[PDB]
Design a protein around this nucleic acid. Structure first.
Ligand code: K
Ligand code: MG
Ligand code: MG
Ligand code: MG
Ligand code: MG
Ligand code: MG
Ligand code: MG
Ligand code: MG
Lengths: 51, 337, 132
RNA sequence: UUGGCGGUACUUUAUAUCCAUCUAGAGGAGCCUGUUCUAUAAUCGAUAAACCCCGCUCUACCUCACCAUCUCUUGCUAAUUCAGCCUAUAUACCGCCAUCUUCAGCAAACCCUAAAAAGGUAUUAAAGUAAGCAAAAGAAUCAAACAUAAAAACGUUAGGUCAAGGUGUAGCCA
């Protein structure tokens, strides 16, 4: 998936620029995993970092 | 005998057996054996000054020589490696993207159209395939002749798009004919704020019904796979569409461009009626937003507002708002379009 | 149908040279002879020997200049002298041609016991008479 | 919407041709020669038109590829666990051809169509266009013509030829 294929990409709450890519700019809703194609493990990890 | 030896072209011509009675009316692969051969190099390993080795080395005029058995075996093995590597190179290829499926041509980019008569490059345009038919007719050439009909669409993603059909006996030719024909039939599609249509569009082209809806930002393209391809070429980012009746690809392409190119912009509506066009977004509250004002004289007669409109409503649109359960297939989670 | 020495029609994408385009019945009408000796004139001898020497000289030049020959070679015999005139592509470096000329001349003079000279005209690429 | 063949037997058409007209033949006898058959220990291929004085502008030996019998085993070459192989498949092919045939078609690239499965002509002209291949022209038969030669694309017959030669695949190496 997009996160796993690139090891240097890190899902951390401080890495806001990465987290913003997974949030809708217009509605501010976090995209569901099928939308971006991330695996469920990383999607759950991303949701926690965004929150 | 040395006099019964033939050239490579005639040896491969016979072995391949491409021209033959079986081939035409119903696998061997050609190879080039002079690819890696360097003029002046033989099995014996002789070194020929001026042919396969430097004529002068460190200021010394070289003389004939021969490589040792160990040195020659290395050179033979090295060439064997290079030949094996070349075979690997032939197997390797750069994967291009599939379309709506893995074995289908629909949705596959084939690049920009060819340059024009006076060096008019079209690098900003992208071409997409929509249908590829392999149809056979009955002509004396093969008894049953072969034909390839290709429907393509082109667009710059900035409002200009067009479609054309190209027919030929070879698929590659049908691509060129369609691709360069479509650049001569560019519609311009009006986009509201550059991301969606100006208003709902409902139309019937022959037996194919299309029903498009204007949507807010972030909605994405929730449309027939062929409409998503065209919408990306046009530049529409957020829209909903439903297609019913016949799924003919040509009627859908003709019907889509017919409806998208006949829509009324807000600036046009203000001029036709003479009134201001105001916008009310729920995320901006009651704030009235003026999006278009009449170019000439603003009228003072309010537009008649009927108590009960006589609009013709679609049961499909209304059914949802009436509380009727939708299908299991509606509004499923899908990848970003 | 006659299949002899005819480069058959393709679909307009095959580049044939002037020599290749013309069928045998145009010999002595539109295109000349690649070899010129006196052995086929009336009351002359050694036709068999001149014809065999030509066959070899054509196979030798192909192998000695592999992939560097733009067209068939032209053989000219005057007295005991043999002259080989070949159009050669500019693929190889210049000095390599000087080696192959010195080698092929010396080798063919000691094989047929006649003075042999090589005349090479270099072309940028094969000349196309027509696309057939 | 096309393609086909059906009984296209209908109207014009062939031009040494379908019948008619004309001349000399074949069909009978004797031989010469090819083929089939019979047959031999004893080639092969061609074998309706488009095989049958055919590959052969050529078999007493040689030629020879066949049969019987005896003999050789690194056995043409600079080298090679290699040389050699007329061993099977022309239904894997190259090559060179027969055939319709001196038949007239084969037509790439563009352009147009209220969509095109296709079509694209009107001359007092209405969407077709500008280039090739064949034909024509040109050249040959030593003035000129005519005639004769040569030329004749794409397909048709998996037509003929692995035995002109080369070659794919499989088979034989005391
Ligand atoms: K053949
Ligand atoms: Mg697949
Ligand atoms: Mg046979
Ligand atoms: Mg004999
Ligand atoms: Mg004998
Ligand atoms: Mg034998
Ligand atoms: Mg004349
Ligand atoms: Mg002519």
């Amino acid at each position: 998936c997009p996160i796993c294929r690139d090891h240097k990409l890190h899902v951390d709450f401080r890495n806001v620029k990465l987290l913003e890519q997974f949030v809708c700019a217009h509605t501010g809703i976090i995209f569901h995993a099928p939308y971006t194609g991330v695996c469920m493990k990383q999607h759950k990890k991303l949701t926690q970092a965004i929150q | 005998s040395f006099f019964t030896k033939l050239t490579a072209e005639e040896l491969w011509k016979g072995a391949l057996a491409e021209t033959g009675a079986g081939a035409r009316k119903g696998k061997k692969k050609r190879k080039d054996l002079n690819r890696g051969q360097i003029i002046g190099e033989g099995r014996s390993g002789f070194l020929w000054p001026g042919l396969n080795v430097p004529l002068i080395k460190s200021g010394v005029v070289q003389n004939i020589g021969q490589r040792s058995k160990e040195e020659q075996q290395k050179v033979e093995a090295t060439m064997v490696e290079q030949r094996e590597e070349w075979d690997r190179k032939r197997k390797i290829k750069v994967k291009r993207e599939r379309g709506w499926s893995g074995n289908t041509w629909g949705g596959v980019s084939i690049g920009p159209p060819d340059p024009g008569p006076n060096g008019e490059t079209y690098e900003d345009f992208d071409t997409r395939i929509l249908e590829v038919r392999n149809v056979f007719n009955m002509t004396a050439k093969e008894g049953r002749k072969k034909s390839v009909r290709v429907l393509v669409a082109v667009g710059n993603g900035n409002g200009a798009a067009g479609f054309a059909i190209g027919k030929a006996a070879d698929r590659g030719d049908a691509f060129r004919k369609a691709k360069n024909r479509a650049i001569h039939y560019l519609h311009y599609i009006e986009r509201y704020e550059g991301h969606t249509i100006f208003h709902d569009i409902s139309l019937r082209f022959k037996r194919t019904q299309i029903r498009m809806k204007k949507q807010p930002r972030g909605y994405g393209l929730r449309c027939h796979r062929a409409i998503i391809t065209i919408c990306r070429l046009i530049g529409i980012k957020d829209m909903y569409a439903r297609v019913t009746g016949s799924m003919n690809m040509l009627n859908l392409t003709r019907g889509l461009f017919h409806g998208l190119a006949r829509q009324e912009t807000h600036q046009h509506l203000a001029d036709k009626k003479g009134l201001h066009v105001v916008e009310f977004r729920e995320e901006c509250g009651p704030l009235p937003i003026v999006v278009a004002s009449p170019h000439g004289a603003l009228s003072k007669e309010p537009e008649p507002e009927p108590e009960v409109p006589d609009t013709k409503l679609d049961w499909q649109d209304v059914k949802a708002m009436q509380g009727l359960k939708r299908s299991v297939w509606f509004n499923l989670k899908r990848p970003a379009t | 149908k006659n299949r002899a020495a005819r480069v058959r029609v393709a679909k307009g994408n095959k580049p044939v040279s002037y020599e290749e385009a013309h069928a045998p019945h145009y010999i002595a009408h539109r295109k000349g002879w690649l070899s010129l000796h006196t052995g086929n004139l009336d009351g002359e001898d050694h036709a068999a020997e001149r014809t065999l020497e030509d066959v070899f000289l054509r196979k030798f030049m192909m192998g000695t200049f592999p992939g560097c020959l733009a067209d068939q070679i032209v053989l000219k015999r005057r007295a005991n002298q043999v002259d080989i005139c070949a159009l050669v592509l500019r693929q190889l470096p210049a000095h390599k041609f000087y080696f192959l000329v010195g080698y092929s001349e010396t080798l063919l003079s000691h094989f047929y016991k006649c003075p042999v000279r090589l005349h090479l005209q270099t072309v940028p690429s094969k000349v196309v008479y027509k696309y057939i």
